């Protein structure tokens, strides 16, 4: 008959619809809280000037477009490791790691995920939080691993179930893989506190699970890179060789540039040497080598202080703006006479929020006020603006009252 008449129509994407539902709304005070990227105080995309300064810096150099090592830019990988681990890190000094440039974080997760399939002989189960980013399960699943859950978010408190996650984690089998967001949870926004993080490390240490980290939001979450990477850095100090997925999409604004990295911290350099060769092997088949523009720009910013001083300044303008929107949404709800306790909205870190609002609530907001968010009740906080934090506080007061 035909080849593809056996090919099913896929399921719709909530995220795409929400925006799409958004691009359809005619309203002039309409908001997209389904948006995945940082937006300026005008709800307009922002390209980081330092990125533009680097883009200029490179162009002045009349460079080539030659293939890149499988691992990526040498300068990028190394610089990217230092960003994550700190200047006076031992791992860097010891040499006991490999860093590879991957297509963004989603690239980081997948290579790492594959490498898990192929070489992680102590398990097939990757423990994801509850609830964790949408792409996570199908990243691992196609990757070839089993998936599992551990308590994280507590829905009544709109906070961290420390006892829950700590209790569940304590129940994870030994030498199993645990995925912990380094900071700025997607999509809840809930994070562990250092003392809480401290207690996790020991639990992982006692268990001997393997820790796999996603730091998709470094710098961007608080505006302090170091704090933001505090857990990854802590886990390693405490004897746990992690692996890290770094995304420069948000903190650096190279969303489409696709800058990312996967880092493995090993006991000794030789092991690193070995891991690298295999990391490569996995990759050649996937794409030959990763993209050129992004790494160069990222490298450019990190590797030249005046530019880096500037970017890291900008990251603060954004992180702080988000902090501000969060604080504002709450002051306003309280000013709209809203009864409830929204201090979660502020308690939370990053650009994603779990409002605790229920779908029937979402719908009132969506149909009645032209506002868009998914039904879990998360908002993307970067779709919020001075202009509209009020239209937002208003509806939420109205529905939740």
Q: Which of residues 371-390 bind a copy of itself (CB under 8 A)?
A: none
Q: Give residues 106-145 in contact with a copy of itself (rule: CB under 8 A).
A: 106-107, 110, 114, 119, 121-122, 135, 138-139, 141-143
Among residues 214, 228, 230, 311, which one is catalytic? 214
As measured in angstroms, the least distance from the Cβ of 257 to a copy of itself is 5
Q: Annotated catalytic residue: which of 53, 230, 250, 311?
A: 250
Q: Which two tokens stand for residue 284?
A: 């050649």
For residue 315, give both structure tokens.
Answer: 């990251």
Contacting a copy of itself within 142-161 (CB under 8 A): 142-143
Q: Can you tell me the distance from the alpha carbon of 185 to that of 215, in angstroms, rounded to the nearest whole number?
A: 9
Tokens 């499988």: give the residue. Answer: 70
Window of 1-9, 145-153, 185-193, 356-364 that interacts with a copy of itself by CB under 8 A: 1-9
Q: How many Å apart are CA 258 and CA 266, to the nearest integer?
A: 26
Concatenated DSSP letters for 108-150? Answer: HHHHHHHHHHHH-TT-SEEEEEETB-TTHHHHHHHHT-EEEEE
Q: By C-beta, is 55 or 336 nearer to a copy of itself?
A: 55
Range 57-76, binding a copy of itself (CB under 8 A) = 59, 62, 64-68
- Residues 184-213 touching a copy of itself, rule: CB under 8 A, are 210
Of 292-351, which residues contact a copy of itself (CB under 8 A)? 292-294
Q: List the interface residues with a copy of itself, window 233-262 (CB under 8 A).
A: 241, 249, 253-258
Applying CB under 8 A, which of residues 24, 47, 313, 387 lies at the interface with a copy of itself? 47
Spatial distance between the Cα atoms of 284 and 280, rounded to a whole number of angstroms: 6
230 belongs to the catalytic site: no
224 is catalytic: no
* The residue to which tokens 């070995």 are assigned: 274
Q: Is 133 a catalytic residue?
A: yes
Q: What radius of gyration, in Å, describes the C-alpha atoms of the chain?
A: 21
**Annotated binding-site residue? 364:** no
SS3 368: helix
10, 239, 305, 337: which one binds a copy of itself (CB under 8 A): 10
How far apart CA 400 and CA 377 sit, in angstroms, is 12
Of 120, 112, 81, the residue nearest 98 (C-alpha): 81
Annotated binding site for substrate: 36, 133, 186, 378
The residues carrying an active-site annotation are: 133, 214, 250
């Amino acid at each position: 008959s035909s080849w593809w008449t056996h090919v099913e129509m896929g399921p719709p994407d909530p995220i795409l619809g929400v925006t799409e539902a958004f691009k359809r709304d005619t309203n002039s005070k309409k908001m997209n809280l389904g948006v995945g990227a940082y937006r300026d105080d005008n709800g307009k995309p922002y390209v980081l000037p330092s990125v533009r300064k680097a883009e200029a810096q490179i162009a002045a150099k009349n460079l080539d477009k030659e293939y890149l090592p499988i691992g990526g830019l040498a300068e990028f990988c190394k610089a990217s490791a230092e960003l994550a681990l700190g200047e006076n890190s031992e791992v860097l000094k010891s040499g006991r790691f490999v860093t590879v440039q991957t297509i963004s974080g989603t690239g980081a997760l997948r290579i790492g995920a594959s490498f898990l399939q192929r070489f992680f002989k102590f398990s097939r189960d990757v423990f994801l939080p509850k609830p964790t980013w949408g792409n996570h399960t199908p990243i691992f699943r196609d990757a070839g691993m089993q998936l599992q859950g551990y308590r994280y978010y507590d829905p009544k408190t709109c906070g961290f179930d420390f006892t829950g996650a700590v209790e569940d984690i304590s129940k994870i089998p030994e030498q199993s893989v645990l995925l912990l967001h380094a900071c700025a949870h997607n999509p809840t926004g809930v994070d562990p506190r250092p003392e809480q993080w401290k207690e996790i490390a020991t639990v992982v240490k006692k268990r001997n699970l393997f820790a796999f980290f996603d730091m998709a939001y470094q710098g961007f979450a608080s505006g302090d890179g170091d704090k933001d990477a505090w857990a990854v850095r802590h886990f390693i100090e405490q004897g746990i060789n992690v692996c890290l997925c770094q995304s420069y999409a948000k903190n650096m604004g190279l969303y489409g540039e696709r800058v990312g990295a996967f880092t493995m911290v090993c006991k000794d350099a030789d092991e690193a040497k070995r891991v690298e060769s295999q990391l490569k092997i996995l990759i050649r088949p996937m794409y030959s080598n990763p993209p050129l523009n992004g790494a160069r720009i990222a490298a450019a910013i990190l590797n030249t202080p005046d530019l880096r001083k500037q970017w890291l300044q900008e990251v603060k303008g954004m992180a702080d703006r988000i902090i501000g929107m969060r604080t504002q949404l709450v002051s306003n709800l309280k000013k709209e006479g809203s009864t409830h306790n929204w201090q979660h909205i502020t308690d939370q870190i990053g650009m994603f929020c779990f409002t605790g609002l229920k779908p029937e609530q979402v719908e009132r907001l969506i149909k009645e006020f032209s506002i868009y968010m998914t039904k879990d009740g998360r908002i993307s906080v970067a779709g919020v603006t001075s202009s509209n934090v009020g239209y937002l506080a208003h509806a939420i007061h109205q529905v939740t009252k």
